[PDB]
């Protein structure tokens, strides 16, 4: 009855997308000049972690980053001099996400304890202490991103995202609609949108203010593990477990480009873009990152030197450096 | 080429390096045990015997060895996307009830709890992240199992059991049918124990199995293995 109505509605959506699409990105940008071979070297190695790193986030100052691992430590890194500004002893060792506030004042962490902890870096007493224990999730906190100094959008293992309010400790909007465990979210530059890929092989856009699911994107196969907006916020790339990164489209709603090779078979853990947006870096599971010409679907470089699986990969705001964490307790900065 | 503030920043980073090295060296002496199985499988009994949402942590000491238990009964999500966080586990404590062979599971009222535990053991043994790590198999509710096999035979679970209905060979058959699923026996050892009301033997079995795993790891370190 109504199931057939939903199926024919989805068929109408697919037919509308196929009617709207008339020329793919590869056909329309085939005449552009490729970047060619791109060589990056490990300028800095941020040693100091004594367990497997999961997530890192850069800073708006483009010099401080932060990274979380399984030793119950979250370290802020002075990436210019390879220094340790702070080291937070976490209460929960199992954390798959860490976030750096755009004001540089707070840091975040979360993982299998289902809690998005917030820490104050600029405390008057000097030491970094807890400010808010954001309880209210039952699944594992897979991603967290500071909307601003007072709000934070999180994706969890209970198939629901949550825009929080740090000044009250309770959510204001719950983003429901995924049929599967949402694994990563990315925040738009205009701060009023965010997309989140999930284990149902779909990435769903949401409005931060109201919570309506504006679009869904069902192009992948296995399950989404990586997501990142374009710098202009009109696209976003999704790395999943079928060894394919797919560029998407906020306006056209189709899949634009596919970034896959036959030599690579394992999935993607993290993705990030360059400032121009022409250089999408995807941290694969084959012990090395890849560099993809985001306009030609070609491979331009490999960021090797990791002896274990690359878990996190962040490109800094001024585009200078790409810090790539992995499971071998190291973060390597590329330039 | 460094200012005084940069020198003090470098010295602070060195002090943080020393503290992190001390913390990591303290944590590498810990033993990481992953708890798996249904919650009604004597998990409360084993945690209270070992002591006396998310993950409850149990830190207990027994003869100069530090233990950690990561019960994941409250993590009702997809295990495929977070089971790779437990690579460095000394053992996996896998509690499976014995008196669930004839009790029907509440989900769909068609499947049995014993065979669901068998499928759980299949998914835990045959996944990629647990290949060379041992599994401390526990079998639960021995007296309830005795009463239930006195009341009704084991053929109501499956009639493939050719033996007579006595506890010793019936439990031996269910242990063998649980252990022969292990695809690799050269690298992995399953340590089966029938849980008892005595609070010493239950933790002594875990101590012995973990010590055997530590012996194997030290052989791998020294290169003899």
């Amino acid at each position, epitope marked *: 009855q109504l199931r057939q109505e939903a199926e024919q509605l989805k068929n109408q959506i697919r037919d509308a997308r196929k009617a709207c699409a008339d020329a793919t990105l590869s056909q329309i940008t085939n005449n552009i000049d490729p970047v060619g071979r791109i060589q990056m070297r490990t300028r800095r190695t941020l040693r100091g972690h004594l367990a497997k790193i999961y997530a890192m986030h850069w800073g708006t100052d483009s010099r401080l980053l932060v990274s979380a691992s399984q030793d119950g430590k979250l370290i802020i890194w002075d990436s210019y001099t390879t220094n340790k500004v702070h080291a937070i002893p976490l209460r929960s060792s199992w954390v798959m996400t860490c976030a750096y506030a755009p004001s540089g004042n707070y840091v975040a962490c979360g993982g299998l304890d289902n809690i998005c902890s917030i820490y104050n870096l600029k405390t*008057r007493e*000097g030491n970094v202490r807890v400010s808010r224990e954001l309880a209210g999730h039952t699944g594992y906190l897979s991603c967290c991103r500071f909307l601003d100094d007072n709000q934070i959008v999180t994706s969890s293992g209970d198939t629901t995202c949550a825009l929080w309010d740090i000044e009250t400790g309770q959510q204001t909007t719950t983003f429901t609609g995924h049929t599967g465990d949402v694994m990563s979210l990315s925040l738009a530059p205009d701060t009023r949108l965010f997309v989140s890929g999930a284990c149902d092989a779909s990435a769903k856009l949401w409005d931060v203010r109201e919570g309506m699911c504006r679009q869904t994107f069902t192009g992948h196969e296995s399950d989404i593990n990586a997501i990142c907006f374009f710098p202009n916020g009109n696209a976003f790339a999704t790395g999943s477990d079928d060894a394919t990164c797919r560029l998407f489209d906020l306006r056209a709603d189709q899949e634009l480009m596919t970034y896959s090779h036959d030599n690579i078979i394992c999935g993607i853990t993290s993705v990030s873009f360059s400032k121009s947006g022409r250089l999408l870096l995807a941290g694969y599971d084959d012990f090395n990152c890849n560099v993809w010409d985001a306009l030609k679907a070609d491979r331009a470089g490999v960021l090797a030197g990791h002896d274990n699986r690359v878990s996190c990969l962040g490109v800094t705001d001024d585009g200078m450096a790409v810090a790539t964490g992995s499971w071998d307790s190291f973060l390597k900065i590329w330039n | 080429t460094l200012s005084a503030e940069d020198k003090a920043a470098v010295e602070r980073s060195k002090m943080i390096d020393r503290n992190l090295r001390e913390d990591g060296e303290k944590a590498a002496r810990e033993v990481k045990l992953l708890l798996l199985g249904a919650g009604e499988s004597g998990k409360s009994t084993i945690v209270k015997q070992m002591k006396i949402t998310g993950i409850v942590e149990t830190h207990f000491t027994f003869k100069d060895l530090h233990f950690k238990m990561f019960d994941v009964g409250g993590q009702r999500s997809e295990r495929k996307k977070w089971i790779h966080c437990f690579e460095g586990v000394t053992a996996i404590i896998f509690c499976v009830a014995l008196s669930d062979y004839d009790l029907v599971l509440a989900e769909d009222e068609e499947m049995n709890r014993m065979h669901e535990s068998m499928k759980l053991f299949d998914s835990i043994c045959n996944n990629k992240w647990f290949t060379d790590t041992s599994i401390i198999l526990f079998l639960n509710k021995k007296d309830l199992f005795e009463e239930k096999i006195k009341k009704s035979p084991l053929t109501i679970c499956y009639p493939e059991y050719a033996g007579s209905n006595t506890y010793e060979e019936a439990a031996a058959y269910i242990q063998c049918q649980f252990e022969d699923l292990n695809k690799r026996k050269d690298t992995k050892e399953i340590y089966t124990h029938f849980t008892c009301a005595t609070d010493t033997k239950n933790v002594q079995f875990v101590f012995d199995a973990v010590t055997d795993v530590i012996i194997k790891n030290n052989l791998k370190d020294c290169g003899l293995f």
Partner: single-chain antibody
Amino acid sequence: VQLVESGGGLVQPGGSRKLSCSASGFAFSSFGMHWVRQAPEKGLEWVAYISSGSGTIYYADTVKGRFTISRDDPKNTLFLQMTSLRSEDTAMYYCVRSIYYYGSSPFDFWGQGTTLTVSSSDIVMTQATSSVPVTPGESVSISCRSSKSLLHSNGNTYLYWFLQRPGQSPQLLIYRMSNLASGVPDRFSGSGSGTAFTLTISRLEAEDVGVYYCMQHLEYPLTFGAGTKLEL
């Protein structure tokens, strides 16, 4: 944050006196510590410094080997044991909180102070003016000169502005030539270039009355300016 000192009073010359700044209300072990003197009529002069974890200790050249500075991290206590007190030891001492990482604000808390009166190649900082007659409501520029460029190769100009209101301890206004300390109103603003230090105070009020000190931190020993006293 609260740092209170003890162990003052009149001392016989050639004698000894134990100073103790019992820090409380903050994580003492993560903060480097200082002692900063002040003559009964003149400005400030730096005395000694101990790093967090006692890694590096620096002394003023006038008291190098005469003063010993130590810390007791479990007790959150600072110390300054003094021997053979001379004629220029009649002054008063401040225990200064400081911290050094990227984006830190060192020299930002100061103790209340204790008084000790005796009985009968450095970058010299010179405040060009000494006093300015200023009514509340107009912008004032405080000029301090330097004998060396404080702009290091990393891009930081290490200049530290202080405000010592009459009857109380100095406090930070500008750290590293451009950045306002915590609790400092936005009307304060330091700007300039090498060896040219101007502190502009738009919309002056009655709380700006006091002596303004320029300090260098590019190297050691730390040297203060003469000080510009502002009165209405």
